[PDB]
């Protein structure tokens, strides 16, 4: 719950979460981020589309 209360609110999958979170988060397919994010989709999908932006941006960053 911890991670959903976030998640459904300001959890940050792009520099906030780390190497296994990213991933696992990565893998939040629609479906799950859906709920856990009860949003609209274009809206939680936005959210996870900018996490994933970061994700390769902090690691082309090294």
Same mark, same amino acid.
């Given at each position: ?10 959890? =940050?999958?792009? @520099? ?6 990213? /991933?696992? #988060? ?6 799950? +981020? =859906?709920?856990? @994010? ?6 939680? /999908?936005? #959210? ?6 970061? +994700? =390769?941006?902090? @690691?082309?960053?090294?």
């Amino acid at each position: 719950s911890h991670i959903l209360t976030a998640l459904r609110e300001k959890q =940050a999958p792009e @520099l906030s979460l780390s190497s296994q979170d990213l /991933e696992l #988060v990565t893998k939040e397919d629609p479906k799950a +981020l =859906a709920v856990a @994010l009860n949003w609209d989709i274009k809206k939680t /999908e936005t #959210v996870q589309e900018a996490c994933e932006r970061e +994700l =390769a941006l902090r @690691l082309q960053q090294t």
